[PDB]
């Protein structure tokens, strides 16, 4: 309006059927079933504690 | 691997007692008298002229308890308790004969510790193992000789009985234990003749570097192939070390070389 009342914008998004994905790949991309990691020695020959 | 006793010399309990309960001006481990003050000079002169006699009872008992600590007859945290008990007993029955016996015991335990600083179990195992087979008494004899040679020449190896079977372990805190009884029970049908269990395979792999076996026999062939495989493993280790050290001027490089190498 000519007689408006300021502003305070707020943004948001809305995913409605999506599973958030964090693939276990070095470059985050999917280059096959087995990933760049997973078959690495560090993650296949040694036990790790995830947190 | 903790130090059993405080003294810098693990052996020589008398030396350890010297280190623990003597002033650090008589000991040796490897000024200008006359300009000292009058009090110090006169004290030293009087002590030298008339030496002060002292009882060597606490020192003897400390040496004995250090010897017991080294022998592991006494735990580390009860050393003071045993020291006090021994002092009480010696004071109760103190005599010149008792002091002489204490000195003799210290000398004997020091000598025994110096001299000291599995075989019987293997002998019992061989005794309970049959010594005659119907498929050539030379492969078995040479294999037994190789086993005895390797168990004798191994620095820290143990042979022991666990119930009805005898075990062979390559080291005190290792992870290579071989059930000798079952291994020989599996080897017996095929002395002089893929079909071997992992236990006897591990036994053969362990004994191959330390072995008279005729090459015509199946065990001879298996030992030759295991020697060849072990030599290939050593040369492969050398090549892997060289290649990796050169290529490091990536863990991916180690992955690639190990995959191409096994």
Residue whose structure tokens are 């002060």: B52
A40, B255 Cβ separation under 8 angstroms: yes
Q: Report the C-alpha gap between B83 and B64 in whole angstroms.
A: 9
Please state how this structure was obtained: cryo-EM
Taking the CA of residue A34 and the nearest CA in chain B, the distance in Å comes to 15
Distance of CA A44 to the CA centre of its chain: 23
B35, exposed or middle or buried, with CB in 10 Å at 0-12, 13-18, 19+?
Answer: exposed
H or E stretch at A42: helix A41-44
- Chain A residues whose beta carbon lies within 8 Å of the beta carbon of residue B251: 40-42
Q: Report the C-alpha gap between B132 and B130 in whole angstroms.
A: 6
**Crossing angle for the helix pair B139-153 and B119-128, to the nearest 10 degrees:** 160
Q: Report the C-alpha gap between B105 and B65 in whole angstroms.
A: 12
Residue of chain B whose alpha carbon sits nearest to that of A41: B255
CA distances from B155 to B107, B160, B178, B204 (A): 28, 16, 17, 19
Residue whose structure tokens are 């335990």: B109
Q: Report the C-alpha gap between B147 and B131 in whole angstroms.
A: 14
Q: Report the C-alpha gap between A36 and B56 in whole angstroms.
A: 73
CB-defined contacts A:B, below 8 A: 8
DSSP state of B155: S
The closest alpha carbon to B147, from B116, B175, B178, B113, belongs to: B178
Residue of chain B whose alpha carbon sits nearest to that of A36: B252
Give the helix ranges, DSSP H, for chain B. 13-20, 38-49, 58-71, 79-92, 96-116, 119-128, 139-153, 180-187, 198-207, 218-247, 251-261
Resolution of this structure in Å = 3.3
Residue whose structure tokens are 């020589």: B12
Taking the CA of residue A40 and the nearest CA in chain B, the distance in Å comes to 7
């Amino acid at each position: 309006d000519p007689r408006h009342a300021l502003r305070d914008p707020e943004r948001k998004f809305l995913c409605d059927r999506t599973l958030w994905r964090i693939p276990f790949s070095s470059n985050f991309m999917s280059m096959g079933s087995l990933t760049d990691l997973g078959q690495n020695l560090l993650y296949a020959n040694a036990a790790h504690a995830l947190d | 691997e903790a130090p059993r006793s405080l003294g810098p010399a693990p052996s020589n309990p008398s030396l350890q007692a010297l280190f623990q309960s003597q002033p650090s001006a008589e000991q040796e481990w490897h000024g200008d008298f006359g300009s000292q003050p009058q009090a110090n000079r006169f004290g030293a002169i009087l002590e030298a002229v008339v030496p002060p006699r002292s009882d060597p009872t606490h020192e003897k008992v400390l040496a004995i308890v250090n010897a017991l600590l080294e022998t592991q007859a006494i735990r580390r945290d009860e050393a003071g308790q045993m020291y006090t008990a021994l002092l009480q007993r010696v004071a109760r029955y103190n005599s010149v004969n008792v002091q002489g016996n204490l000195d003799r015991l210290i000398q004997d335990v020091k000598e025994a510790l110096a001299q000291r600083e599995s075989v019987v179990a293997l002998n019992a195992f061989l005794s309970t193992q049959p010594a005659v087979v119907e498929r050539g008494q030379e492969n078995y004899v040479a294999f037994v000789s190789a086993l005895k040679l390797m168990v004798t020449e191994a620095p820290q190896s143990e042979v022991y009985q666990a119930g009805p079977s005898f075990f062979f372990q390559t080291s005190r805190h290792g992870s290579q234990t071989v059930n000798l009884s079952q291994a020989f029970d599996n080897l017996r049908p095929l002395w002089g003749v893929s079909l071997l269990t992992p236990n006897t395979r591990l036994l053969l792999l362990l004994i191959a570097p330390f072995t008279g076996i005729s090459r015509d026999s199946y065990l001879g062939h298996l030992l030759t192939l295991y020697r060849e495989t072990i030599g290939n493993t050593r040369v492969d280790e050398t090549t892997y070390n060289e290649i990796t050290e050169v290529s490091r001027a990536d863990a991916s490089n180690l992955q690639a070389t190990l995959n191409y190498l096994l």
